[PDB]
Design a protein around this ligand. Structure first.
Ligand code: ADP
Ligand code: ADP
Lengths: 439, 215, 223
């Protein structure tokens, strides 16, 4: 429509207050590296950000964090208007409050632990009603900006007084939690992720389109790969990331039910996703339900496989429901499922390579205070044959090791572990090199 | 192999010769409980008898009548038999032709290939280059192609592909070209006029992209 | 300062507790010095102390026998202080616990008590429960009183009465010939791993409300 509206893309610079832009699009809009910008998104909402030149960014796109996206009430691939904002001057007062469901369990001073380090030499733009996220003490905490002295928006300089006055606030319906899984929560497989995103893009984001054209959207997506590769993770993410409803079908849990009530459940799953469209149905450990037609001993196991295939066909293309499923290999599955109109789309979520493993590690060390000598790159290289979940447990163990070392010294009282004591807790490269001897 | 237009052909022949078409889907029949599975199968033949002439098309036959030893348990054999009875019980004066499809001969119970049942076997193979071209043309007949689109080239590149592979290839190449324009159509929605639709050409690039996806 | 983490005993003697050399120097204790140990639930017990050079500085090795009287599990905290004020007893009174003596007859002084105390010079406390091995069964004895109350040493001079009726077990008191890590050998390595896996989620379970880390939930045992 205008030379200032843009398509919202994934952030590569994982910082809350910055958005990236292609060099020519900054020249076009006459913006400067570091200039602060006002972004307007859906539902009356706006947010304030620094802007930086990204030479891998698309010209008509703008990279931005989930944090930002939320405050703008937009998903990936939507449209937002961006305009210059050099009028923002430093604040005096800021009132932030933590959101109750991100602070159950932590005690006392959360200023020193989160706010302070998040703002040291920050010069962060902020807006009233913004909700931002701070990492530390092995849990992320969400804070809402209840007011600012230069209202509605200000920058936060060393001068700015910051108040977090007691009572944590309730979450609004509109506001969505940030622990919720996103694509930023998964690493080492951009290539495969990209494919998923574009497959699901139109049928989930622009579903009314398929009334207007006679073209067929993919209905079923199959996810290959060893176990623990984030096959489930990806599906969880994509559903949240594209605002779709998510119904999980757990293979074994379905076989746990008696005969016929096993199908009554399976059918009821498809009826639930139909009801709340658009939706992703995710079938986990598919081969538990639909293994090769000869691997199924006895009738009721075959009656199940069929019941599924009928629901997969019975899936109207106008339903707006994508069925994703995962398994450890192709050969495990009944080839009947790979027919045109069912699981016609196969994606190979492989084994993260060194560079991927690094990301995974970074994703699982983002809430824990690491020591200077921690070399996650080194760790990645050492962990040659590891899947994502291997690495997520490795970080879990290395942390629990570091806690055990301190748990002796914390003899003085319990359960006295303040959020502050928590941030005192760094995780040494030694605790990692130890955790390697386990996995 | 699957996706070769075995169903397609049967659908076509029925319409093309003004015949009534009843579809029997193999798995859908096994989805039903025991005995109500046969009550359906029998009711299919009663529906085609009723509306003669007709083609009954049994899709994914092997789902119903696999080799007599591949059937574990009784009710799976009781089904195979129930079919064979209906196939015999099929009067030649009924005016009903039963067509059925499967991925191979060996999957099927050889009892079905007896004189008076499935005595006629046709081998819908894998389209060769020249065939693949046609398939492509059939699925690009409603979309505006760009000048640089070389469907002949595409055919040659898609060496091992069945018909349905190519039908999805076209579907993807088009959905790709729509995504490219979908960014530029930011101005309003759901504002895509039939005119805006015809403005939408599909470049040879969109095809060469869609090739990197399929099997 | 004087508080310590309670570790496994390597010197399998009821009356002795081990300590790292520098921690003895720090606390100004000499090898063989007798010490008072305080644990949970109002409980204390008296012990000899020896220098163990494989022991951790902030840890104290001790027997299950001791741990029990202190009402502490492994990896807990206890205060230790010197006790040179402790003197030979005149008159100890011990009684066996009924559920460790069903089946054995007559004089149990000669069989257990006597050899447990020959040249013992064992520190003991009223309310202590100790364990003696022999005659193919282990017997638990509670010290019902001592003449230097509450705690005394037991020298050759000390008269020891086990007067008939065995006593009932308290709820608090745990059978000592129940099952412990000292009942299993050949697998320290594997045992260590189990212990640390389960350490926090079983001993410090409230911790996992405070952090977003995941404890192991399932442990599989091959062999
Ligand atoms: N590529 C990855 N990036 C980030 N986290 C991962 C990745 N792979 C695995 N994980 C982590 O390990 C676990 C994988 O579980 P799941 O999603 O069930 O994988 P799969 O379905 O492949 O078995 C998740 O809890 C996730 O946090
Ligand atoms: N030879 C062909 N010509 C035209 N279209 C085809 C051909 N083969 C497959 N298709 C397309 O692919 C799909 C094949 O599905 P189906 O008829 O079930 O094939 P099969 O029964 O061999 O699996 C149809 O939707 C059809 O449009």
């Amino acid at each position: 429509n205008r030379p200032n509206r843009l398509i919202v893309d994934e952030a590569i610079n994982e910082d809350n207050s910055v958005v990236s832009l292609s060099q020519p699009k900054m020249d076009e809009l006459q913006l400067f590296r570091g200039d602060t910008v006002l972004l307007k998104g859906k539902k009356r909402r706006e947010a304030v950000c620094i802007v930086l030149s990204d030479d891998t960014c698309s010209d008509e796109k703008i990279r931005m964090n989930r944090v930002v996206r939320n405050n703008l009430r937009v998903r990936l691939g939507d449209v937002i208007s961006i305009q210059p904002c050099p009028d923002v001057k430093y604040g005096k007062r800021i009132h932030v409050l933590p959101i109750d469901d991100t602070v159950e369990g932590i005690t006392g001073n959360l200023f020193e632990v989160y706010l302070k380090p998040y703002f040291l030499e920050a010069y962060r733009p902020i807006r009233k009603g913004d909700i931002f996220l701070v990492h530390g003490g092995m849990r992320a905490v969400e804070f809402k900006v209840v007011e600012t002295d230069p209202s509605p928006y200000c920058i936060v300089a060393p001068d700015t007084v910051i108040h977090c006055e007691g009572e944590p606030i309730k979450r609004e319906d509109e506001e969505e939690s940030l622990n919720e899984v996103g694509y930023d929560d998964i690493g080492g497989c951009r290539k495969q992720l990209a494919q998923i995103k574009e497959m699901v893009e139109l049928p989930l984001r622009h579903p009314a389109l398929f009334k207007a054209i006679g073209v067929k959207p993919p209905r079923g997506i199959l996810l290959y790969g060893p176990p623990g590769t984030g096959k489930t993770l990806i599906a969880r993410a994509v559903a949240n990331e594209t605002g779709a409803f998510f119904f999980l079908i757990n293979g074994p849990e379905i076989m746990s039910k008696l005969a016929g009530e096993s199908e009554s459940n399976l059918r009821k799953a498809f009826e639930e996703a139909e009801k709340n469209a658009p939706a992703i149905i995710f079938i986990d450990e598919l081969d538990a339900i639909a293994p090769k037609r000869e691997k199924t001993h006895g009738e009721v196991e075959r009656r199940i496989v069929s019941q599924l295939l009928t629901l997969m066909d019975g899936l109207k293309q106008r339903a707006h429901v994508i069925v994703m499923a995962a398994t450890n290999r192709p050969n495990s599955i009944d080839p009947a499922l790979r027919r045109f109109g069912r699981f016609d789309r196969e994606v190979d979520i492989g084994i993260p390579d060194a560079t991927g493993r690094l990301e995974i590690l970074q994703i699982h060390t983002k809430n824990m205070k690491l020591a200077d000598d921690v070399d996650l790159e080194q760790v990645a290289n050492e962990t040659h044959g590891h899947v994502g979940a291997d690495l997520a447990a490795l970080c879990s163990e290395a942390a629990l090791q570091a806690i055990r070392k301190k748990m002796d010294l914390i003899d003085l009282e319990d359960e006295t572990i303040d959020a502050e004591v928590m941030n005192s807790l760094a995780v040494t490269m030694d605790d990692f090199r130890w955790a390697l001897s386990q996995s | 192999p699957p996706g070769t237009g075995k169903t397609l052909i049967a659908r076509a022949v029925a319409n093309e010769t003004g015949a009534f078409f009843f579809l029997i889907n193999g798995p859908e029949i096994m989805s039903k409980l025991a005995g109500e599975s046969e009550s359906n199968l029998r009711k299919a033949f009663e529906e085609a008898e009723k509306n003669a002439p007709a083609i009954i098309f049994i899709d994914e036959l092997d789902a119903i009548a696999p080799k007599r030893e591949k059937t574990h348990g009784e009710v799976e054999r009781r089904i195979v038999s129930q079919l064979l009875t209906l196939m015999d019980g099929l009067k030649q004066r009924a005016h009903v032709i039963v067509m059925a499809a499967t991925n191979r001969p060996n999957s099927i119970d050889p009892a079905l290939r007896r004189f008076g049942r499935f005595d006629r076997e046709v081998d819908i193979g894998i389209p060769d280059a020249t065939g693949r071209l046609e398939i492509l043309q059939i699925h690009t007949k409603n979309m505006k192609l760009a000048d640089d689109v070389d469907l002949e080239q595409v055919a040659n590149e898609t060496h091992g592909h069945v018909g349905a592979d190519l039908a999805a290839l076209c579907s993807e190449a088009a959905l790709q070209a729509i995504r490219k324009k979908m960014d530029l159509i930011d101005l309003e929605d759901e504002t895509i006029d039939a005119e805006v639709m015809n403005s939408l050409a599909v470049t040879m690039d969109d095809f060469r992209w869609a090739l990197s996806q399929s099997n």
